Amino acid sequence: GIVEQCCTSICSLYQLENYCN
Amino acid sequence: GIVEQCCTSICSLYQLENYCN
Amino acid sequence: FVNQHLCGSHLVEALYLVCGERGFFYTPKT
Amino acid sequence: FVNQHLCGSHLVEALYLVCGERGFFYTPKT
């Protein structure tokens, strides 16, 4: 999930936008 | 929604918890 | 911290602190 | 600000800034 992709590993805009409404 | 209840008016714990998963 | 006008980043912070490991949804559109 | 390790309040802030008026969901459980 988001913690694994953005906290534990380096985050990206691509991934963050996956969590926008 | 949350803006109306917590930003435009005074927020509460009761209402904030309505938006927890 | 919850019993005030909370907007933008301030509201998101309050949700974060209240909801903990559950997480939350911030839907200013709804 | 997005291309780093982002945790806790720092992650929530990034989501807030990226997603704008759409809002977002923060589900560290999922």
Swiss-Prot record, chains C, D:
Result of altering residue 24 to S: In HPRI; Los-Angeles
Protein name per its UniProtKB record: Insulin B chain
Result of altering residue 10 to D: In HPRI; Providence
Domain of life: Eukaryota
Residues represented out of the complete protein: 25 to 54 of 110
Gene: INS
Bilayer-spanning residue ranges: none
Native source species: Homo sapiens
